[PDB]
Design a protein around this nucleic acid. Structure first.
Ligand SMILES: Nc1ccn([C@H]2C[C@H](O)[C@@H](COP(=O)(O)OP(=O)(O)OP(=O)(O)O)O2)c(=O)n1
Ligand SMILES: [Ca+2]
Ligand SMILES: [Ca+2]
Ligand SMILES: [Ca+2]
Ligand SMILES: [Ca+2]
Ligand SMILES: [Ca+2]
Length: 897
DNA sequence: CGTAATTAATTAATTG
DNA sequence: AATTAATTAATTA
């Protein structure tokens, strides 16, 4: 096997690299790297180096890395360009690994942990860390073992050792229910006093120093606390042992009075899972407590205990230690399903960057292009300073707010990455400019042809057609990877619906789940055996098919997110290849591509229907159009269709056979008209929406831009077993909206599109009657807590203070005195509830941290004054009024006249 | 230190 | 109430 690195850092003029050799063992080294930088030189001088624009460069090899740093400083005030990779560690990895890396994750020591700290004077701040650490659970990837460290004696209580026998027992039995699969993998370690626990953990840390370190909030709590408590006990230099190189940095955050810090251990790539999640999950959550996320991702129970958390050890020490392990493990379950760690490594290595650098797409693309160019002996241009500027983006069409019965959408395959490829947009493929006609003259094909030599964009930019640019070439590779993983995801999706269609009639047999590969569609062979399967074996097959989908999803969505970020990065000033001329060239083309095809599709469906100038494209957004199919089903008659599925198959066949060839005819012409490099505007059909055949439902509606819902039967190949709702932008998809309300409105949309006006009315009074009996947390609103510092004038709402902050400033006065109350963290998310006028809180609403039940001392007083009539009108009624008024419907039958 | 476009619910102020 | 403008938080792409 080939060699690969694990972690890379720079300390002085020396690079510290932990790696895996050709045999497959862990080795650490220290190299006096000699970095080379570049500068422009005389025309007539034979050398093998050129900058990206083609101009020659002379190589300056430096004796050490300070000499290379010094050199750039001098080059600046003198006024010359210092070309080459100035982030030197990357230039080390590009040399020491001149090939495409193939890592073996089993060799990479991934470790994730969590600690527990008992604090009876408030929330234990990691910066002070004046309280004892009374637990640590620390998993290892190569050991496959849970290393539990239990403190039995502390000046906050002395507790009997943790029973592994009780731990295994079920919750309902009196136990803690630690999943039996890991129970044999726990290696329990209790301790006499605090100091001797920490000493052992460090030896273990040395013997088994992590390469990837993770967990839940480990960066903002665990690591900060571990380091700081050791600083208070063993010293700073003994705490510096957490880095396998001894070097560590401390970053302190603001903050008027409150001090929070983030520690940087050199030689360990830290990826905090909470970060990973927000970045790669594509879910905006109400709460980011480990409990809530596990509930959401794994449908597992919630960690139930009595008393505040600061007193849990005292009473239920058994559950305290047990729950600690579960936490450490729950993350591992989230990753087995989500596979973000795998993604971090897939990306990190392909880019040749520190693994924690995957959070930065600019740092990612800078390494990808540098390595792309270096093999061609080209030299990267120096990073410049730019003023921040707004620039035009995507075109969004204004729809007529209305119901729409039959709808087919048509979407562009990875649009912005495609335009880069079609036009050949790169920093070095720029030719010049041209006279820009109104965008509309290009949309209507009436303006003069921009170029007969160059590839052009309606933002007035010409690009070379001869040899490929470095960006289009680099984005293609990653787009191809993205694609492969999507074709997987889509199968596991299609195969999910084959299991669900068959689950209609499950057999009362005793059979077992077939061993099949879910990334590829079931053959009409395996399909037939599924139709004979037990309900037991069908549901287990469905799980497997869905987990495959998730895993596939993660791969394809974040590879997408990555390449889209490159397009966006051209608009961020810190990106080495920042160029508004290029970013606008993309977006502007996008605007033309959509509005051009809006014309073309309308022009076709008039020529097919023999009609003259009627509208069919009703709404468009960035890269997709929505086509009304009313006239199509009208022309063949509603009477003629056997079942709902029959007209779906008919529109399916129509869109693929009659439309797409005219759509691809239209995009080929636009290519000619723009004299582009390559035609890459592929628009296939996406969703097929409509009511159930012979039902009262309305199909779909629009309430305006970026807000609508659809009854979708087919979603780009996946024929759904049960009709599925596509809701975009409505309060059902907004995290701020209460869970009970999200659920309720979704049933309203469901009945609107599927069952008719009459159905809506019946359910509306069904809900209004159940509302006042529902749990507060479910019916409470959510919002982020930004700028709470500003609107606070020593308590009480300031000038123009937002509704939620107003609510928080209520909380602070209520918990004035109570230490056993959770503090509202700036940036964190909170629940918001409106009180009635005349309450012990002296305000119109209150707010408290998300996830957590509101502290005992005020909880009673909140429910004692909650304004349900307002909460219902605000969250539920007003948005539904929005839906029905834009759909020509009534939710509550008129009591008047 | 990836992006823009767009919404709805706020509030402070003015509708003689 | 009902307009507008200004601000915040959240979407869709
Ligand atoms: N976070 C995002 C997502 C969207 N867009 C741009 C890039 C896309 O090209 C275009 C359309 O986005 P889509 O949601 O339709 O995703 P793609 O077209 O990129 O991929 P797919 O082929 O799956 O539709 O909008 C963007 O700039 N940044
Ligand atoms: Ca905990
Ligand atoms: Ca798309
Ligand atoms: Ca698509
Ligand atoms: Ca069956
Ligand atoms: Ca789309």
């Amino acid at each position: 096997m080939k060699e690969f690195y694990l972690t890379v850092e720079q300390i002085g003029d020396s690079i510290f690299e932990r790696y895996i050799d050709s045999n497959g063992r862990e080795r650490t080294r220290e190299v006096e790297y000699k970095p080379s930088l570049f500068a422009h030189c005389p025309e007539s001088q034979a050398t093998k180096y050129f900058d990206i624009y083609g101009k020659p460069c002379t190589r300056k090899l430096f004796a050490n890395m300070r000499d290379a740093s010094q050199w750039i400083k001098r080059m600046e005030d003198i006024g010359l360009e210092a070309l080459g990779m100035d982030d030197f560690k990357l230039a080390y990895l590009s040399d020491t690994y001149n090939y495409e890396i193939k890592y073996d994750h089993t060799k990479i020591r991934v470790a994730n942990f969590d600690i527990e700290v008992t604090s009876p004077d408030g929330f234990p701040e990691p910066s002070q860390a004046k309280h004892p650490i009374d637990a640590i659970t620390h998993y290892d990837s190569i050991d496959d073992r849970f290393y539990v460290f239990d403190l039995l004696n502390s000046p906050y209580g002395n507790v009997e050792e943790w029973s592994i026998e009780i731990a295994a027992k079920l919750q309902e039995q009196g136990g803690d229910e630690v999943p039996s699969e890991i129970i044999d993998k726990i290696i329990y370690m209790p301790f006499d006093n605090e100091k001797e626990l920490l000493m052992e953990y460090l030896n273990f840390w040395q013997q088994k120093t992590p390469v990837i370190l993770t967990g839940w909030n480990v960066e903002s709590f665990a690591i900060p606390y571990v380091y700081n408590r050791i600083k208070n006990i063993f010293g700073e230099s003994t705490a510096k042992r957490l880095s396998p190189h001894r070097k560590t940095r401390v970053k302190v955050i603001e903050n008027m009075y409150g001090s929070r810090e983030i520690i940087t251990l050199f030689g360990i790539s830290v990826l905090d899972y909470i970060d990973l999640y927000k970045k790669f999950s594509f879910t905006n959550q109400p709460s980011y407590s480990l409990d809530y996320i596990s509930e959401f991702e794994l449908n597992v129970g919630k960690l139930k205990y009595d008393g505040p958390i600061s007193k849990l050890r005292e009473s239920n020490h058994q559950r305290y230690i047990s729950y600690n392990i579960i936490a450490v493990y729950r993350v591992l379950q989230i990753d087995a399903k989500r596979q973000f760690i795998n993604l971090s490594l897939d990306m990190g290595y392909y880019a040749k960057i520190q693994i924690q650098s995957v959070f930065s797409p600019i740092k990612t693309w800078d390494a990808i292009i540098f390595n792309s160019l270096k093999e061609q002996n080209k030299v990267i241009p120096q990073g410049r300073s730019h003023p921040v500027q707004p620039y035009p983006g995507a075109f969004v069409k204004e729809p007529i707010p209305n119901r729409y019965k039959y709808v087919m959408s048509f979407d562009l395959t990875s649009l912005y990455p495609s335009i880069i490829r079609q036009v050949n947009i790169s920093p070095e493929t720029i030719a010049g400019t041209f006279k820009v006609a109104p965008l509309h003259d290009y949309i209507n094909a009436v303006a003069e042809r921009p170029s007969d030599v160059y590839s052009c964009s309606p933002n007035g930019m010409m690009y070379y057609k001869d040899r490929d640019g470095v960006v289009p070439t680099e984005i293609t590779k990653v787009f191809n990877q993205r694609k492969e993983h999507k074709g997987y995801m889509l199968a596991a999706q299609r195969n999910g619906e084959i299991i669900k269609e068959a689950l209609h009639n499950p057999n009362l047999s005793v059979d077992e789940p077939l061993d099949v590969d879910y990334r590829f569609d079931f053959s009409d062979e395996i399909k037939e055996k599924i139709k004979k399967l037990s309900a037991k074996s069908l549901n287990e097959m469905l799980f497997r098919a869905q987990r495959t989908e998730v895993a596939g999803m993660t791969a394809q969505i974040n590879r997408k997110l990555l390449i889209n970020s490159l397009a966006g990065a051209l608009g961020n000033v810190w990106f080495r290849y920042y160029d508004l001329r290029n970013a606008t060239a993309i977006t502007t083309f996008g605007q033309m591509a959509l509005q051009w095809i809006e014309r073309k599709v309308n022009e076709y469906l008039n020529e097919v229907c023999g009609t003259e100038g009627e509208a069919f494209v009703l709404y468009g957004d960035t890269d997709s159009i929505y086509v009304s199919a009313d006239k199509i089903i009208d022309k063949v008659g509603e009477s003629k269709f056997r079942d709902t599925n029959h007209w779906v198959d008919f529109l399916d066949k129509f869109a693929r056979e009659r439309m797409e060839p005219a759509i691809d005819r239209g995009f080929r012409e636009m290519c000619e008209y723009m004299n582009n490099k390559q035609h890459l505007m592929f628009m296939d059909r996406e969703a097929i929406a409509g009511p159930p055949l012979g039902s009262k439902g309305i199909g779909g509606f629009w309430t305006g831009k970026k807000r609508y819902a659809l009854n979708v039967w087919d979603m780009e190949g996946t024929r759904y077993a049960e009709p599925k709702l596509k809701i975009m932008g409505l309060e059902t998809q907004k995290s701020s909206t209460p869970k009970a309300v999200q659920k309720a409105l979704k049933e309203c949309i469901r009945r609107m599109l599927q069952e008719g006006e009459e159905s809506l009315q019946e359910y509306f009074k069904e809900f209004e009657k159940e509302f006042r009996q529902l749990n507060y947390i479910s019916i409470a609103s959510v919002s982020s807590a930004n700028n709470i510092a500003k609107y606070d004038v020593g308590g009480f709402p300031g000038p123009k203070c937002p509704f939620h902050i107003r609510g928080i400033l209520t909380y602070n006065r209520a918990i004035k005195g109570n230490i056993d109350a959770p503090q509202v963290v700036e940036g964190e998310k909170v629940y918001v509830l409106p009180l009635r006028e005349g309450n012990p809180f002296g305000d119109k609403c209150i707010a408290w941290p998300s996830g957590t039940e509101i502290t005992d001392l005020i909880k009673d007083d909140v429910l004692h004054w909650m304004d349900y009539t307002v909460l219902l009108e605000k969250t539920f009624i007003k948005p539904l009024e929005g839906f029905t008024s834009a759909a020509k419907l009534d939710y509550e039958k008129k009591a008047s006249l």
